[PDB]
Design an enzyme around this catalytic site. Structure first.
Site, PDB file in Angstrom:
ATOM      1  N   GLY A   1       1.254  -1.024   0.288  1.00  0.00           N
ATOM      2  CA  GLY A   1       0.121  -0.462   0.051  1.00  0.00           C
ATOM      3  C   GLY A   1       1.010   1.260   0.135  1.00  0.00           C
ATOM      4  N   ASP A  12       9.646  -4.218   8.875  1.00  0.00           N
ATOM      5  CA  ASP A  12       9.274  -5.118   7.909  1.00  0.00           C
ATOM      6  C   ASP A  12       9.525  -6.027   8.867  1.00  0.00           C
ATOM      7  OD1 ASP A  12       9.310  -3.791   5.229  1.00  0.00           O
ATOM      8  OD2 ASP A  12      10.346  -2.922   6.033  1.00  0.00           O
ATOM      9  N   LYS A  29      -1.157   3.619   7.083  1.00  0.00           N
ATOM     10  CA  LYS A  29      -0.008   3.717   5.926  1.00  0.00           C
ATOM     11  C   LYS A  29      -1.773   2.679   5.214  1.00  0.00           C
ATOM     12  CE  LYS A  29       1.419  -1.192   3.934  1.00  0.00           C
ATOM     13  NZ  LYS A  29       2.444  -2.181   4.670  1.00  0.00           N
TER      14      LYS A  29
END
Length: 324
Positions: free
Chosen positions: A27, A157, A44
């Site tokens: 996104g 991440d 996000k």
């Protein structure tokens, strides 16, 4: 009670609680001011979150992971919302995390040894937690490590830094793939240069073996494929170099730690928990403030469900979210 949302365009229309102000795109992600807390945050808006079964499961996977992580050195979930009022209307998902300063690429004039210790300690502290939940990062690298001004670090991440066994599709691995990566990062912090700047996977392995040496009979015994074994033992035998002569002037305890992380055989590689008690970290280590995680349930990964079911399970996770 449900917040008041407002709407705004910046390609698509963003619909967010009014507590979040001054969205400016980064996104897709917007930097925001969180009026409730005074923090600068990242919002996000997931793109296409339920377009297919794979999208849906990935959406669920990301949300579940981020909800699980609760640790100083690991990015956690500040908020998650949707403009939808029911499962029927549920089409959009927003995640809110700490807006992080730089990453470790920005930092790579050398770092002092004291500062290398501090950064590497924090990575290992975060990794001990992540690994205690049976999660393997798999792609740790400078761009996945964010720092603030205070130089407090968080892992985000979840191919110069990849372990050779992850690089090469070998099923003989464990969580210490991430430890290889930390060894490469730490080395680059000490010297200012990339440890193994390979051009392709072959060039990369050649650079690695040049430093660590070709596999020893003992490691060769763990290799189940004959073509793989024949390949390896056909190479010219490189002997293990001495690290001292590669990291000249570095703290001797850093060099010793590097030799323990940058080992080809992963059964012998130092673990995050062991590395934290290494003498190199003596000024920062505290064995009662290196916490571990709850066990993390990844059974969902083996399931094949309908789109509508991954969507529903995701909605459940949004609804039950409890903030910090």
């Amino acid at each position: 009670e449900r917040p008041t949302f407002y709407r705004q365009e910046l390609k698509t229309i963003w619909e967010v609680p009014e507590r979040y102000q001054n969205l400016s795109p980064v996104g897709s992600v917007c930097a925001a001011f969180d009026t409730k807390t005074g923090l600068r945050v990242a919002v996000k808006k997931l793109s296409r979150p339920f377009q297919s079964i794979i999208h849906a499961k990935r959406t669920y996977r990301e949300l579940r992971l981020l909800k699980h992580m609760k640790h100083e050195n690991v990015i956690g979930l500040l908020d998650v919302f949707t403009p939808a009022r029911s499962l029927e209307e549920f089409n959009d998902v927003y995640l809110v995390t700490h807006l992080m300063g730089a990453d470790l690429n920005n930092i790579v004039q050398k770092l002092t040894d004291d500062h290398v210790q501090f950064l590497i300690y924090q990575i290992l502290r975060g990794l001990k937690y992540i690994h205690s939940a049976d999660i393997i990062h798999r792609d740790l690298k400078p761009s996945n490590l964010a720092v603030n001004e205070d130089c407090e670090l968080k892992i985000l991440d979840f191919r110069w830094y990849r372990a050779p066994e992850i690089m090469l599709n070998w099923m003989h691995y464990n969580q210490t793939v991430d430890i290889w990566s930390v060894g490469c990062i730490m080395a680059e912090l000490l010297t200012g240069r990339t440890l193994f700047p390979g051009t392709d996977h072959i060039d990369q392995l050649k650079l690695i073996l040049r430093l660590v040496g070709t596999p020893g009979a003992e490691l060769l015994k763990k290799i189940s494929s004959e073509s793989a074994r024949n390949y390896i033992q056909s190479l010219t035998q490189m002997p293990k170099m001495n690290f001292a002569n590669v990291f000249i002037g570095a703290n001797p305890l850093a060099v010793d730690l590097l030799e323990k992380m940058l080992v080809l055989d992963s059964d012998k590689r130092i673990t995050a928990a062991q590395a934290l008690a290494h003498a190199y970290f003596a000024q920062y280590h505290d064995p009662d403030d290196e916490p571990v995680a709850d066990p993390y349930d990844q059974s969902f990964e083996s399931r094949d469900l309908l789109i509508d079911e991954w969507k529903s399970l995701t909605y459940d996770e949004v609804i039950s979210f409890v903030p910090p």
